Every structure is written in structure tokens, then in C-alpha cells.
Amino acid sequence: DFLNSAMSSLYSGWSSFTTGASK
């Protein structure tokens, strides 16, 4: 799961939208 966080900071940082699907 931890790796999931380091990923959100990379994918959920440039798109600032993927969070909708990730969350």
C-alpha cells in the first residue's frame, strides 16, 4: 500500500484529476 502513496504524489500531481478514480 505504501507504494500507492508515492504513486499518487506522481500521477495525482500532474493530472490533479486521476484522484477521482483513485479515490
* CA distances for 3 relative to 10, 11, 12, 16, 17, angstroms: 11, 12, 13, 18, 19
Q: ∠8-9-12 over CA atoms, to 5°?
A: 55
Method underlying the structure: NMR
Instruction: From residue 7, give the alpha-carbon distance in Å to each of 14, 21.
Output: 11, 14
Cell numbers of 20, please?
A: 477521482
SS3 readout for 1-23: CHHHHHHHHHHHHHCCCCHHHHC
Comparing CA positions, the residue from 18, 23, 1, 20 lying closest to residue 10 is 18
Q: Which three cell numbers stand for residue 23?
A: 479515490
Contact 2/16 with Cβ under 8 angstroms? no
- Using CB atoms within 10 A of its CB, is residue 13 exposed (0-12), middle (13-18) or buried (19+)? exposed
